[PDB]
């Protein structure tokens, strides 16, 4: 599947916001 990270308040360059991960946490997944 795709790679995703649960980051605090931001997503890294290239990561799309897939969903919310927590209150202060975003669920970001690299475009590539």
From Swiss-Prot:
<protein>
    <recommendedName>
        <fullName>Defensin alpha 4</fullName>
    </recommendedName>
</protein>
<feature type="disulfide bond">
    <location>
        <begin position="6"/>
        <end position="21"/>
    </location>
</feature>
<feature type="disulfide bond">
    <location>
        <begin position="11"/>
        <end position="28"/>
    </location>
</feature>
<comment type="function">
    <text>Host-defense peptide that has antimicrobial activity. Exhibits activity against Gram-negative E.coli (in vitro). Probably contributes to the antimicrobial barrier function of the small bowel mucosa.</text>
</comment>
<feature type="disulfide bond">
    <location>
        <begin position="4"/>
        <end position="29"/>
    </location>
</feature>
<comment type="similarity">
    <text>Belongs to the alpha-defensin family.</text>
</comment>
């Amino acid at each position: 599947g795709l790679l995703c990270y649960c980051r605090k308040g931001h997503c890294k360059r290239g990561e799309r916001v897939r969903a919310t991960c927590g209150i202060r946490f975003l669920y970001c997944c690299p475009r590539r």
